[PDB]
Amino acid sequence: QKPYKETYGISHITRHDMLQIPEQQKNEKYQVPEFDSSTIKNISSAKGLDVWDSWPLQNADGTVANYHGYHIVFALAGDPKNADDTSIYMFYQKVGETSIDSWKNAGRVFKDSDKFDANDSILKDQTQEWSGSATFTSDGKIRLFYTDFSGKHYGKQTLTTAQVNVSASDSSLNINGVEDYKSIFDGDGKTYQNVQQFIDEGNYSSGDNHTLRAPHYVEDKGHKYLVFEANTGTEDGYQGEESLFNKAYYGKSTSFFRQESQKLLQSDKKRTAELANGALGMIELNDDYTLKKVMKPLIASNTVTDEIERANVFKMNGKWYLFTDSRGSKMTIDGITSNDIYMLGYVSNSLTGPYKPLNKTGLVLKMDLDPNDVTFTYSHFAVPQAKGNNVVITSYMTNRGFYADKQSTFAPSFLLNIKGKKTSVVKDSILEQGQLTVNK
Ligand SMILES: [Ca+2]
Structure with a gap:
């Protein structure tokens, strides 16, 4: 196969940039801070459930919404014994509260019968509800986006929406x-x-890893969009043997391409790399939240990994910031290990790009704790704030099903400082578990 170069007019997480991260990540500015295990509580209203991927009801620009005097957080929860028990629950607190103990549980968003009543062929085959986003419409409605996972149809994942009808009183x-x-x-x-x-x-037994999930709602100039985890298709640089010879996926220079590509072809990661075609995709929606337009991916991760999760994008102080979480264990990069888990980040002058890496390489957060560590966190997510140079990082803490007495719960939030094309974790900025805003 002859070397070639093709970007497909989109941005790319390159092998060269990723290779810089192992040395870079030793800098505390890019590290999830150490948390104190004796401060960590289960979500008391979630009654022995694991509670993992969680997301706030947001305004169109990504700031935290106020629903009738309450903050609302949707989260995946389920029985710690059953890895396939995943539904979306809705938690809520009065605006002003900060303690994890302030989070009341409104129960599941969906009834089992809702997917049938929807008159929706794909939905009636759903077996799990995976994570997404929620926006607070201009007419005061709770508009949910999530991933319909079909376990019985080879793990089909479908971006899905619903309006959640919620009555508000002074108490609940x-x-x-x-x-x-x-x-x-x-x-x-x-x-x-x-x-x-x-x-x-x-x-599954091919080694391929199909994704179509983590739908994130955002607007720009009154146009509506979802940005989501996906994989590329046949026309924007697909998986395959040929992909390893595309210099766009390597970056730096032809010298670097020749050296790295031949190492990869001689390695035990060649097949993994060939299958790796992760993408943060984008679609525009109509005003009734149906599909208007399939758009080109904002970024892809060919050869590097098949799995870039928890897509997030927002405008902050004149620039657009694009983020995704990803496990080192599923990457093919020398020096990135099975313990390493990242939030990667990119910046643009426009929502639709082009996006270049934050902190030169893409590294924003690194978390490398043992899976057994009670303070292990995952699903890091930058919540934009109304003003200032800080966003709040939420994540879930404690792996699902690991401990009888310590369930997946809201991690202590913390601050990430963002200016221009640079980020740094704010020193000693640990907040309450699940805290959404700096403002109180
Ligand atoms: Ca793939």
């Missing part, structure tokens, strides 16, 4: 039901991989 919030509950996007094969393409490979 109550979920009355949902409406406008519908599939929006299941891939198109050319821009984003679909489940059939995964099945064509031999599904």
Whole structure:
């Protein structure tokens, strides 16, 4: 196969940039701070459930919404014994409260019968509800986006929306039901991989890893978009043997391409690399939240990894910041280990790009604790704030099903300082578990 160069007009997480991270990550400015295990509590209202990936109800610009005097956080929860028990619950606190003990549980967003009542062919085959985002509409409605996972159809993942109907009183919030509950996007094969393409490979035992999830709502100039975890399709640089010869995925120089590509081809990571075609995708939505336009990915991670999760994007002080979480264990980069877990980040003058790496390489956060560590965190997420140079990093703490007495819970939040194309963790900025804003 001859070397070639093709960007497909999109940005790329390159091998060269990733290779810089192992040395860089030793700098405390890019490290999830150490947490104090004796301050950590289970979510008391979640009653022995694991509570992991969690997200705030947001305004269109990503700031935290105020619903009738309450903050709302949606989260995946389930029985610690059953790895396939995953539904979305809605938690809430009065605005002003900070303690983890302030979070009340409104229960599941969905009834089991809702997916059938939706009159939606894909939804009626759902077995789990995976994570997403939620926006607070201009007419005062709670608009949810999440991933419909079908365990019985080879792990199909479909971007899905619903309006959550909630009555508010002085004391409580109550979920009355949902409406406008519908599939929006299941891939198109050319821009984003679909489940059939995964099945064509031999599904799970092929080593391929199909993703179409983590839908994040954002607006710009009154246009509505989802940015999401995906994989590339046939027309924007697909997985395959040929992909290892695309210099766009390497960066730096032809010298670097020749050296790195031949190492990769001689390595035990060649096949993994060939299959690796992660992407942060984008679609525009109509005003009824249906699909308007499939758009090109903002960034892709060909050869590096198949799995870039928890897509997030927002404008802050005149620039756009794009983030994703990713496990070192599924990467193919020398010096990145199975313990390493990252939030990577990119910056643009426009929502639609082009995006270049933060801190030269893409590194924003590094967390490398043992999976057994009670203070292990995952699903790091930057919550934009109304003003200032700080965002709040939320994450879940404690691996699912690991400890009888210590469930997955809200991690202590902390601050990340962002200016220009640089970030730093704010020294001793640890907040309460699950705290969403600096303002109180
Ligand atoms: Ca793949």
